[PDB]
Amino acid sequence: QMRLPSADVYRFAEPDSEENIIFEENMQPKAGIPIIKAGTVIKLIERLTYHMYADPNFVRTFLTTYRSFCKPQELLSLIIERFEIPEPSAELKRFRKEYIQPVQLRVLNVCRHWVEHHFYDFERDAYLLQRMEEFIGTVRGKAMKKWVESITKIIQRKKIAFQSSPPTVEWHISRPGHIETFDLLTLHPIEIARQLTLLESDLYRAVQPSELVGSVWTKEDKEINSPNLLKMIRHTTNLTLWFEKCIVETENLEERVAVVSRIIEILQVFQELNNFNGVLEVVSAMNSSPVYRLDHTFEQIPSRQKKILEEAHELSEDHYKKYLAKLRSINPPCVPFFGIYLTNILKTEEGNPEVLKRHGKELINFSKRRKVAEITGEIQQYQNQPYCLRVESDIKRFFENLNPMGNSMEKEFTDYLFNKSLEIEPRNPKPLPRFPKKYSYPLKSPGVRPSNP
Amino acid sequence: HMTEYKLVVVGAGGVGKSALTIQLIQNHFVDEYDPTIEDSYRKQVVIDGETCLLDILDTAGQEEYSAMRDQYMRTGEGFLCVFAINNTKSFEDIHQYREQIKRVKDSDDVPMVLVGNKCDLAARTVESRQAQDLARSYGIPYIETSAKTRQGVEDAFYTLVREIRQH
Numbered sequence A: 001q002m003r004l005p006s007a008d009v010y011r012f013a014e015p016d017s018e019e020n021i022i023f024e025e026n027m028q029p030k031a032g033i034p035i036i037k038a039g040t041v042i043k044l045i046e047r048l049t050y051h052m053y054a055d056p057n058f059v060r061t062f063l064t065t066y067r068s069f070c071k072p073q074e075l076l077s078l079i080i081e082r083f084e085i086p087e088p089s090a091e092l093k094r095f096r097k098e099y100i101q102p103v104q105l106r107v108l109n110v111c112r113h114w115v116e117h118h119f120y121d122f123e124r125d126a127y128l129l130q131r132m133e134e135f136i137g138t139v140r141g142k143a144m145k146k147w148v149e150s151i152t153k154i155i156q157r158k159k160i161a162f163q164s165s166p167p168t169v170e171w172h173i174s175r176p177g178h179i180e181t182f183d184l185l186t187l188h189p190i191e192i193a194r195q196l197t198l199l200e201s202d203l204y205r206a207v208q209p210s211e212l213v214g215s216v217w218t219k220e221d222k223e224i225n226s227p228n229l230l231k232m233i234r235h236t237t238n239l240t241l242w243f244e245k246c247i248v249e250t251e252n253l254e255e256r257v258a259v260v261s262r263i264i265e266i267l268q269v270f271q272e273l274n275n276f277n278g279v280l281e282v283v284s285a286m287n288s289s290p291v292y293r294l295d296h297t298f299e300q301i302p303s304r305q306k307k308i309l310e311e312a313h314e315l316s317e318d319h320y321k322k323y324l325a326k327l328r329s330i331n332p333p334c335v336p337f338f339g340i341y342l343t344n345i346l347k348t349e350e351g352n353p354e355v356l357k358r359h360g361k362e363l364i365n366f367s368k369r370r371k372v373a374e375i376t377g378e379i380q381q382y383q384n385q386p387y388c389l390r391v392e393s394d395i396k397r398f399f400e401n402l403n404p405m406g407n408s409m410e411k412e413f414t415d416y417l418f419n420k421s422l423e424i425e426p427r428n429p430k431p432l433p434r435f436p437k438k439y440s441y442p443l444k445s446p447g448v449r450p451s452n453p
Numbered sequence B: 001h002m003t004e005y006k007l008v009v010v011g012a013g014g015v016g017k018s019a020l021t022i023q024l025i026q027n028h029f030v031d032e033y034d035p036t037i038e039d040s041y042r043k044q045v046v047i048d049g050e051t052c053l054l055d056i057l058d059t060a061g062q063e064e065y066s067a068m069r070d071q072y073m074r075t076g077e078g079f080l081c082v083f084a085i086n087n088t089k090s091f092e093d094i095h096q097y098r099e100q101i102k103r104v105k106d107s108d109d110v111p112m113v114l115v116g117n118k119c120d121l122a123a124r125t126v127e128s129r130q131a132q133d134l135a136r137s138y139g140i141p142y143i144e145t146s147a148k149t150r151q152g153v154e155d156a157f158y159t160l161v162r163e164i165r166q167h
């Protein structure tokens, strides 16, 4: 039993009670550490920099989700307060080795981790970085110098700011460099899928937890706080709209059958590549009111492709049951569909209290924050691995600059798409009209199987 | 085989729409919600002494995926068109949600309900009379709910099941 100073002098000395810290029945799966359910900010900071053992999971979780219950400037103050330990012989030499030195090292680990993985707090508050550099400068002694130097190297790096050969790029009617002829039917359907998988893979990888924690993509400053997520969602939306537009603007039935068939071939390749974002871009285009109603077009579609579309659609049925099952079964590289994560993070934050009350005292609900960090961690596990596919700068640029809406607002474009659907395939009993062909080039697909070894 | 009602929540984002379904499913006196499990969106209820299962789709958070609304709406028989009583833009947006639902279902008579959600203690900008009037012009019920007290949540959902049953 070790003697710690009075809570009147050192706030983190106060003993544990139901009024300041509570736990879950389970223990850390691989570490045997108890799981904190809720506690006061002091008790959470005490356990972040605990003397008996290091708690990397709790540190990793905390620094991701603390901004709801504590400001960066307030966290720094708390960890500086924790480091500056007063004393309360045998007891005084033991306390120094078993309490002060371990706690001081744990505060420096927090600092190091914060700076390494959440430098945005410092980019957005230069005085926060001022106080952090100052504190680090005051740190002295052997054992600390090693960490103080490593932290100083990270700060300055943050201020400064791998496989075998990939497959051969595929070409169909459009030739390399002839960007003016690039379209859905002229580019090779394998390369449309690959180049879109490459854009969508980079977009997915760029989303950071700072854009998700606190459900900030749904708030008034979402354009400021969640820019990479929003670009990602907008590419996906642009691609769905382009697929719908390609379909309904192809008024000739035989050419429109060629268009739906080519989109299904692209979907097949997205399924091969595990680009589930791309799979849903296609599924969403097909379930849209302008596309879903085109029964004369679907009548002429080969059964192989119908079945391909049926399976892709079924990944979404029953609250994404099969999608979830399929994502767990595959291994990277893949491009997950982000929408599920966004709904689960939102509903976790909105469906659980920020605070629990025990014996009339407010405890920060940390388990709510852990649950969010589990989802942000799940998103990060698929951001590590890249695709072994070559970029084609012209095809890339063609998809980056797609603008099916043009200068029209959503409603105006959405109605244009639907009124086009009604024009090309009128509501029964109206007879099916015939429309002239618009494609000079041949409609036969080259297939989804590569041409060269 | 008991009857299963496939319900869809549609409404503006950023205004606490998720509270409606969360509060429904949350066994009152339990505030430990987990959206990742099956029981989080399914609930066995007894409406007018006829037991049924309610499957609720709430895509709260995916509003930027504007081209996925048709995919999602297409899965439902009934719809709760939700707006916040402190946000006039979320109220003004109902006319288009209804227009899309009608267009997705190829019907002018879709089992549908209008829900006015009191998501916080910010000021009311949408008077009940405006909403009752809007709901009347469309020919659908109007239910007001509280996100804190759980008042009106059962009524909103049970009224929709009745609209489907009486269709």
Ligand SMILES: CSc1nc(-c2c(C)cccc2C)nc(N2CCNCC2)n1
Binding pocket: A283, A286, A287, A291, A292, A295, A298, A299, A301, A305, A306, A307, A309, A310, A313
């Ligand atoms: C590939 S042939 C096809 N595909 C689909 C379809 C499927 C199977 C899933 C999602 C969206 C759509 C449009 N639906 C239909 N039908 C729509 C309903 N009427 C019969 C055709 N045909």
